[PDB]
Structure 1
Amino acid sequence: VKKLINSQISLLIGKGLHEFDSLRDPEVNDFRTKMRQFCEEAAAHRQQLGWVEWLQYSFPLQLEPNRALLVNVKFEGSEESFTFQVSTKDMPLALMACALRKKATVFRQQPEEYALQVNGRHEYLYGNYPLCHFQYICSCLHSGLTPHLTMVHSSSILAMRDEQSNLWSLEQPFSIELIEGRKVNAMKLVVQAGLFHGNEMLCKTVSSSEVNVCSEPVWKQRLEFDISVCDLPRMARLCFALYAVVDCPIAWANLMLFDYKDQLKTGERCLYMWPSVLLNPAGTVRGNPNTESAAALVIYLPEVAPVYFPALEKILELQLREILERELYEHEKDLVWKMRHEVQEHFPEALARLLLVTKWNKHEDVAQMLYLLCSWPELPVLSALELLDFSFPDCYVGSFAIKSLRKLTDDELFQYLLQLVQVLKYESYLDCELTKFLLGRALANRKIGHFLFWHLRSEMHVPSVALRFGLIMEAYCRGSTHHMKVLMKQGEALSKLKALNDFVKVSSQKTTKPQTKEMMHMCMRQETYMEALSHLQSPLDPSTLLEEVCVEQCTFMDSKMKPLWIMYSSEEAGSAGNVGIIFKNGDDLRQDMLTLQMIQLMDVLWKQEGLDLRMTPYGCLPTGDRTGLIEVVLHSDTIANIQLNKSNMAATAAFNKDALLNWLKSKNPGEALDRAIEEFTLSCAGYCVATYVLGIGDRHSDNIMIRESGQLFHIDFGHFLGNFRVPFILTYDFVHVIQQGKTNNSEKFERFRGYCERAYTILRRHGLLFLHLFALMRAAGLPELSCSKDIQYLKDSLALGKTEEEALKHFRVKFNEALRESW
C-alpha cells in the first residue's frame, strides 16, 4: 500500500517522487522528512475531531460578509420531505426542531444531534447564525428560490470522518573567484556580480574582465566586494549576470551566501544559469534544472576560517518623526533610526518604515534592529501583508510577519491565498515559515487544502518552482490520503477534457460545427469518458458536486482555443445540481483569476459597508499549463447576442437601444421589471468602478454578459492596469436601461452616479490592502504586473495621494467625461 500511495502522489502532483530521491540533496531530504512528520501529526489530530469540528474542517461555513420564508427539509435516507415557513431571523436549530417535530407526528413518536446539508452540495448549515447570514439562504432570497435542506445526523457525519482515515571575527572584504563559463553567444563577455539584501544593494556591483565570445570562457580572477565578511546579513544573496558587449544579456544566476543550516558557503560551485529576458535579485536562488543545455558558471567561495550565522541569543547580546511618518530623505532616515525605541514604543505599526532605514550591511545595526523586533507587538493583518514583500528579506522579519498573520480568519486566508502562494517564489530555502503556515492551515481546512493544491499544481510546468511546489504537494498528501484520491479524480477528469479539447480543435478545422459537436458527444459517451468526467468535486469550488455529465448539453465555443462548455445534472441536488464549467486550454488564465479575485474582494469590502452592488463573483481556476476552468453562470447571455436583435424573438425592437430593455422585460414581466432594472443599475455601477480601478479596457458587447435577473457582469479580461490609462466607461445602451427607457431621467441616473461614487470611495479606504496584494503578486511574473508603473496605475486610479474630497472631484470629472463620450 505504501508503494501504491507513492505512485498515486507521483501521478497527482505531476512529478515522480523518485526524482526527489535522485537529487541526493540534504535540504530536499530534510524538507521531505520534517514536513511529512508535521503533516502526519495534523492527520492524527483530525481523525479524532468531534463531529461538529469535523464538519468545520471538511465543510467550512459559507457566510455573508424579519421576513417569512419557505424551506423544504428531508431526512437523509428518505423520499418524504416537508415544507415549513420560518423566519429569516431563525437559527438552523429552530428549523431542525420543526423538522423533528414533523417527523415524530408522521412516525407517531434532539436537534443538537443534526446538521443541515444543502441538497446535492458539500455545504452545511449549522451554528449560531440566523438563516439569512448563510450565503445559500441569502442567495435563495434574492433569486426567489426555496431552500432545500437535508437533516444529517451526527452518526452519519462521524462515518464520513471514519471512512476518510490515512562570524563576527571576519573583517577581510568578501570576495569570490570567477573561474569559467560554458555558453552560447555572438562581441566580448562580462560577468556582473552584486550582493543583495532583497532589492537593496549591500555595496557596489563589481564587473568581470571583458573576454571574447570565444569558448567556454575562462576567467580566473578575484572579484572583491566592498563589504566585510562579518557584515554579511543572514539572507545575503550573490547575483550574477552574464552578458555580451562590443548590450545583449545572456543569463543570470543567484545564490544565498549561507546555506539552509546557516553555515557560510565554501568553496567551488557550479551555477546553471537561467536564460535572459541585467541583475535579477528577486530571481530564484536555485540553479536551472536543464543542466544539459543551460549555460554554466563555476565560482569558488574562499575558505575564510566552519562558521554558522550567530544564534539569536548572541544577536540579542550585541518631534518631526510623526510629521513625516505617514520615500524619505537621508536626514529623515537618520531621525527614524535614532528614535527606533520610540518607534517600537509609540508607533509599532511603523515597523516597516524602520526596517527600510536600517543598514542591512552592518551587523551591529542589524543586531540593533533584531533586538527591537524580538519584543515588537503583533501587528494587524494589513501591516503583516506588507512585511511579506521581497523588500523584507530577513528571516526574522519573515517569521514575525507570519506570527502576525496567524490571526487571519479562514475566509481572509482564502481571499489572500493566491498572493501567499506567489510569495513562496521569494523564499530562499525550502523549509520556511510560510510553507509550514500554509500547510498547517490547509490541513485544518479542506477548502484551504483544495485551493492550495491547485495553485501549486497549476505551476508544475514551470521549472523554477516545480521542485518547491512538488514537495509541498507531496507533504500535503501525506497529511490527507483521502483528499489525495478526491484530487486524483479531478485530475483524471482534467486529463480527459484536454484530450477532448485537442480533438475538438482538430475537428473544427475540418468540418461543420454540428459535425464536430456530434463527434464530441460520441467521444464523451465512451465508457472511459463517462466515468472520468462524472462524480467529481468541482476544482472551481469543492462544495459543488459535478454528478452526471449531460452530454447532450455539452458543446464548444468558436473563439481561437475552442473552449469546452460542459454541463452536469444531479437528481439529488434537484436544480442547483444543474451546473456548468468551461474548460479552456491554450491561454494563460492567471490574469483572469487575479482580476476576478480582486473584483470579488471589492464586493466583500462593499458589503462590509452595507453596499450590495449585486455582483457576480464566479470562479476561475488555472489547473495546468495554459489550462484551467471557468464557472458557468447559467441564465445569462452576452450583450451582443441580445443586441443581434433577431426577428421573431421576445425582445423585438423598433430601435436597437430598446433591445436590452425589451430582453429584460421578457424575462421580468410586470412588477418584476423594476427590481431587474435595479439589479442592472447596481451591478453596472460595481463593474464600471471595478474595471476603471483595475484599468480593464477593451470592454465591449461580446465580453459583457447579463443575467435574466438584470445583473450585469464581465468575461474574458485579456488586459488590466492600462496594459492594452483607460477612461471611465459609460455605455449608452446601459445608461438607457438605467433611465428605464426614458431619454431624460436624472433621478435614476444620479442614483446610479451615487452608487459609483459610494463604491469608489469605499475602495479608496482599502487602497492599501489592494497595494500590498498587488505588491505580493509581482512574484507571479505576469507580464502585465511586472514593474512599478503597473502599481502606479492602481495608486493613480485610487487617487491615494489625494484627500477624499479631491479624489471624489477628480472622479467626478472622469465620470462626467465618460457621460459626454456616451454619444
Structure 2
Amino acid sequence: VKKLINSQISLLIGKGLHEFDSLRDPEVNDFRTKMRQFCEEAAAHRQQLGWVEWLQYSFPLQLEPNRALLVNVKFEGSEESFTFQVSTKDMPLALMACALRKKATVFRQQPEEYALQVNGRHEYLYGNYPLCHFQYICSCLHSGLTPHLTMVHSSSILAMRDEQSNLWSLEQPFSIELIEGRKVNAMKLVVQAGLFHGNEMLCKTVSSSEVNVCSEPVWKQRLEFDISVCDLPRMARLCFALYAVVDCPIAWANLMLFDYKDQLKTGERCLYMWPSVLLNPAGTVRGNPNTESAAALVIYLPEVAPVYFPALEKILELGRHEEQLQLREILERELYEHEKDLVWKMRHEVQEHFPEALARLLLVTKWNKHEDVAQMLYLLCSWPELPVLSALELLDFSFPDCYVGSFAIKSLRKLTDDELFQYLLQLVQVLKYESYLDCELTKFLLGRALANRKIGHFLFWHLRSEMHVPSVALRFGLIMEAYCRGSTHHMKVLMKQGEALSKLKALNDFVKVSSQKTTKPQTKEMMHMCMRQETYMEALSHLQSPLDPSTLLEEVCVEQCTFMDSKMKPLWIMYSSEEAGSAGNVGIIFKNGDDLRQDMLTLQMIQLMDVLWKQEGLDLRMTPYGCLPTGDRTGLIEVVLHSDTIANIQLNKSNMAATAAFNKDALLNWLKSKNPGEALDRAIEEFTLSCAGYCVATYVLGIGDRHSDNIMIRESGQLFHIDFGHFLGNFRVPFILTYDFVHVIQQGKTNNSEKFERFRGYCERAYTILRRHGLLFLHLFALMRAAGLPELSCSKDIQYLKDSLALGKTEEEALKHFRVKFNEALRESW
C-alpha cells in the first residue's frame, strides 16, 4: 500500500522518489520528513471536520464578488424532481425547506441536515447567502437557463469524507579562495564575485585576474570582500559570474553563506554553473543538476574557527540597545542618501505613525552592519500586522530577510480563500526567490492547499507545469510529494487528469503529422477513430477539469471533437453529461508547442479587473476563460461556447441569416439573428459593456497585434479577446476603437452620441477604478518577474503599467490623458 502510493507520486509528479534519495542531501531529507508529517497532520484534521466544514474544504463556495426564478430540485437516489418559483433574495435553507415539503406530500409523510449540489458538478449551495450571491445562480439568471440542484443529506457527504481518507566576534574581512574552472569559450577568462542581500550589494564586487581561455582554467587566487565576517546578514548570497573578455558572458552561480541549519559554510565547494543570457543575485542558489555538460567553478570558503547565526533572542537583546521631521511625510507618498538618513533616524516614528511604510524603512537599513539589522529586527518583532497589499510587496526579492519574510506570511494569514486563489500564481513564482527548501511560504502554501481542495488543485498544476525546468524541478517535486501525502484521494484524482493529458499529447502529435500529409476531414476521421479506442475512451472520460475542479468532464463527444488550423493544430475536445444537462456540455482546447504562462497571467489580470469593477458595482460583462499551463509548452484553454471570431462573422458567408450589404453591418446582422426582437437591445448593451472593459484592459495591459481573428463575440453580444501572445506594448500601443464596433454601440446608426457618450463614460470609470488599485497591479507584476517571462524581464516592462495607469499623476491629469488617448483612437478609427 505504502509502495503503490510512492510509485503513484513518482508517476504523478514526473520524478522518481528514488531521485530525492540519490542526492544524500540532509536538506532534502529534512524537508521531506518534516513536511510529510505537517501534511499528514493536516489530512488528520480534515477527517475530524464537521460535514459543513468538509463541504467548505472539498467544495469551496463560488460567490459573486425582489425577483422570482424557476429552480428544479431532486433528491439523490431518484429521477423525480420538482420546479419551484423561488426568489433571488431567498437563502438555500428556504429552497431546501420547500424541497422537503414536496417530498413529504408525495411520500405522504429538517432543512439544516442537507446541502444543494449543482447537477453534475462538484459545486454546492449552502450558507446564509441569498441565491443571487451564488456564481451558478447568476450563470443561469444571465444565460436565461433554469438552475438544476440536488438535495444531498449530511450522511451522504460523510460517506464522501470517509472514502476520501488516507558570530559578532569575527571582525576579519570575508574572503574566498577561487581555485579553478571546467568550461568552454573562444580571449581571456575573468570571474566577477559579489556579496548580495537581495537586489543590493553588501560591498563592492571583486574581480579575478585574467587567465587565458582553456577548458580547465586555474586561479588559486584569494578574493577579499570589503565587509567583515560578523557583518554577513543571514540571507547573504555569494554571487559569481564567469565571462570571457578581450565582454562575453558564459556562466553564473550563487550560494548562501549560511546553510539551512544557519551554520556559516566551510570549505571546499564545487559550483555547477548555469548558462548565461552580468551578476545574477535573483538566480537559484542550487547548482546545475546537469553535472555532465555544466561548467564547474571550484572555490574554498576559509575556516574562521563552528559558527552559527545568532538566535533571535541574541539579535533582539542587541537590537533593544523636531517638528521639521516630517519632512519624512512629504517623501512617503528611489530617494537620496540624506532622505535615507532621515528615515533611519525616524525609524521609531515610522513604526508608531506610518506602519505601512515598513518596506521604505526596510530598504534604508544598512544590511551590511549587524547592529543596524538587529535594531530593524527589534522594531519588526513589535511591528503591527500590515494590510495584505503591503504584505504582497514584502514577498519581493528586494526584502530577502527571513524575518521580514516570516512577517509577510504572518500578515497574509488573514487572506480569504478567494483572495489567495487570485494571487496563488504570484505566490508560487515567489518560491523561485526562496533560498532554502523549508520555508514559511511553502508551509503557508501547503497548509492552505490542504484546507481547500481548489487551492490544492491549482497549487499542484502551477508546480507540475514547471517540472521540465531543472532550476525548480527539485523544489516543486518535493512540495507536490508533501501535498500528495496530505491528500491520497486527490493524488489519484490528479493522476486521472495526467492520464487524460498524456493521451491528448499523443493524439495531438498524430494530428500535427497527419495535417501536413492529408485533408482536414481525413485527419478528423482518424483522430476520432483513435479517440474511440478503449484506452483513449477510458482516459479521456470521467475526470475533473484541470481548468476548474468543479467542472466534471464526463463522456467525451468524439463526433464534436476537432482541431484548429492555427500553427500548433490545437485539439478541440467536447464533453457532455446527462446528469448536468447544459452545464455538462463543456469544451476544452488542448494546445501543445507554445508557452501559455503569459496568456494565463493576462487572463488572470483581466479576471482581477472584472473582480475590482464588480466590487465598485460595475459589471462590464467580461469573459475571463480558463487557461492553464499543464506541462512543457503544454496547456488547456476553456472553450467559450456559442461564440465566433469577428473574421468568421465578417467573412460574410452566403446562405446564412447574418448576410450584410455592407461590412459595418455584419456584426449587428449576426446579433439580430442570435437575439431576435426584444432580445437585440440586451445584446447591444452586453456588446457595449464588454467592449468598454476590453478597451481599457487591452490598453492598461498593453495588448498588441489585435485583428478580427483574435477578437470573439458570444451569441449574447459579449465581446472578448483570445490568444494573448504579447503584452505590455512588447511586439507603447494606443487605445483601440473600431467603426464596426462603434456602429453596434450606436445601435446601427451613423450618429447616436447619447449611446457613444454613455460608452465613453464606461471606459473612463473602468479606468479610474483600476487606477485606485494601480499598486495591486504593480506589486503582482513585480512578483511575476520571478517567472522568467521574456515580456516581463525588467523594470521597463513594469514601466508600461505605470504610464498606461498614469500612476505618478492625479485623477484630473490622468482622466485628461485618458480623454486624449480615447480621442486619438476615435480619430484613427476612419
Band the TM-score falls in, shorter-chain normalisation: over 0.9
Q: Give 1:28 shift.
A: 0.2
Deviations 1:604-636 (A, max 9, x none): 000000000010111000000000000001000
Distance 1:8 1:540 in 2: 22
Q: Give 1:327 shift.
A: 1.0
Distance 2:140 2:814 in 1: 37
Distance 2:574 2:410 in 1: 44
Deviations 1:427-466 (A, max 9, x none): 0000000000000000000000000000000000000000
Alignment correspondent of 1:646: 653
Distance 1:384 1:186 in 2: 47
Distance 1:4 1:141 in 2: 47
Distance 1:43 1:68 in 2: 42
Alignment correspondent of 2:248: 248
Distance 2:712 2:575 in 1: 22
Q: Give 1:325 shift.
A: 1.2
Distance 1:683 1:489 in 2: 36
Distance 2:193 2:209 in 1: 12
Distance 2:641 2:737 in 1: 26
Distance 2:426 2:618 in 1: 26
Deviations 1:641-667 (A, max 9, x none): 000101111111111110000000000
Q: Does 1:343 align with 2:346?
A: no
Q: Give 1:305 shift.
A: 1.4
Q: Does 1:10 align with 2:10?
A: yes
Q: Check whether the contact 2:627–2:637 (CA below 8 A) recurs between aligned residues.
A: yes
Q: Give 1:15 shift.
A: 0.3
- Secondary structure of the 1:285 match is coil
Distance 1:54 1:364 in 2: 49
Distance 1:92 1:190 in 2: 71
Deviations 1:383-420 (A, max 9, x none): 00000000000000000000000000000000000000
Deviations 1:494-530 (A, max 9, x none): 0000000000000001000000000000000000000
Q: Check whether the contact 2:190–2:242 (CA below 8 A) recurs between aligned residues.
A: yes
Q: Check whether the contact 2:557–2:576 (CA below 8 A) recurs between aligned residues.
A: yes
Deviations 1:720-763 (A, max 9, x none): 00101000000111001001110001010010000000000000
- Secondary structure of the 1:195 match is strand
Distance 2:661 2:185 in 1: 67
Deviations 1:287-307 (A, max 9, x none): 000001100000000001110
Distance 1:64 1:599 in 2: 16
Distance 1:722 1:616 in 2: 22
Q: Give 1:319 shift.
A: 2.4
Alignment correspondent of 1:450: 457
- Secondary structure of the 1:72 match is strand
Alignment correspondent of 1:529: 536
Deviations 1:63-89 (A, max 9, x none): 000101010001111111100001100
Distance 2:333 2:651 in 1: 54
Distance 1:323 1:216 in 2: 56
- Secondary structure of the 1:314 match is helix
Q: Give 1:215 shift.
A: 3.6
- Secondary structure of the 2:70 match is strand
Alignment correspondent of 1:158: 158
RMSD: 1.0
Deviations 1:574-626 (A, max 9, x none): 11100000000000000000000000000000000000001011100000000
Deviations 1:79-136 (A, max 9, x none): 1110000110000000001001011101101100100000010000000000000011
Distance 1:142 1:571 in 2: 22
Q: Give 1:326 shift.
A: 1.3
Distance 1:214 1:689 in 2: 55
- Secondary structure of the 1:784 match is helix
- Which of these residues, 378, 383, 395, is aligned with residue 402 of structure 2? 395
Distance 1:617 1:149 in 2: 25
Distance 2:246 2:334 in 1: 37
Aligned residues, how many? 823
Alignment correspondent of 1:32: 32
Distance 1:382 1:486 in 2: 34
Q: Check whether the contact 2:272–2:294 (CA below 8 A) recurs between aligned residues.
A: yes
- Which of these residues, 535, 546, 555, is aligned with residue 539 of structure 1? 546
- Secondary structure of the 1:577 match is strand
Distance 1:84 1:176 in 2: 78
Distance 2:828 2:316 in 1: 64
Identity over aligned pairs, percent: 100
Q: Give 1:689 shift.
A: 0.4
Q: Check whether the contact 2:239–2:281 (CA below 8 A) recurs between aligned residues.
A: yes
Deviations 1:1-36 (A, max 9, x none): 100000000000010000000000000000000000
Distance 2:367 2:291 in 1: 34
Deviations 1:505-563 (A, max 9, x none): 00001000000000000000000000000000000000000000000000000011000
Distance 2:524 2:247 in 1: 52
Distance 1:591 1:339 in 2: 42
Deviations 1:220-254 (A, max 9, x none): 01000000000000000000000001111000000
Q: Give 1:219 shift.
A: 0.4
Distance 1:570 1:215 in 2: 62
Distance 1:41 1:550 in 2: 42
Distance 1:647 1:444 in 2: 55
- Secondary structure of the 1:578 match is strand
Deviations 1:342-367 (A, max 9, x none): 00011101000000000000001001
- Secondary structure of the 2:94 match is helix
- Secondary structure of the 1:769 match is helix
Distance 2:813 2:72 in 1: 52
Q: Give 1:214 shift.
A: 2.3
**Structure 2 unaligned runs (5+)?**
318-324
**TM-score normalised to the size of structure 2?**
0.99
Distance 1:615 1:324 in 2: 39
Distance 2:585 2:153 in 1: 26
Distance 1:751 1:710 in 2: 17
Distance 1:351 1:641 in 2: 54
Q: Check whether the contact 2:508–2:592 (CA below 8 A) recurs between aligned residues.
A: yes
Q: Check whether the contact 2:184–2:214 (CA below 8 A) recurs between aligned residues.
A: no
Q: Give 1:329 shift.
A: 1.0
- Secondary structure of the 2:382 match is coil
- Secondary structure of the 1:374 match is helix
Distance 1:271 1:238 in 2: 11
**TM-score normalised to the size of structure 1?**
1.00
Q: Check whether the contact 2:194–2:239 (CA below 8 A) recurs between aligned residues.
A: yes
Distance 1:588 1:45 in 2: 38
Q: Give 1:145 shift.
A: 1.0
Deviations 1:138-184 (A, max 9, x none): 12111111111001111100000010010000011000000000001
Distance 1:185 1:817 in 2: 51
Distance 1:75 1:57 in 2: 23
Counterparts of residues 355-374 of structure 1 (less than 5 Å):
355-374=362-381
Distance 1:77 1:215 in 2: 73
Runs of 4+ in 1 over 6 A off after TM superposition: none
Q: Give 1:48 shift.
A: 1.6
Q: Does 1:742 align with 2:762?
A: no
- Secondary structure of the 2:581 match is coil
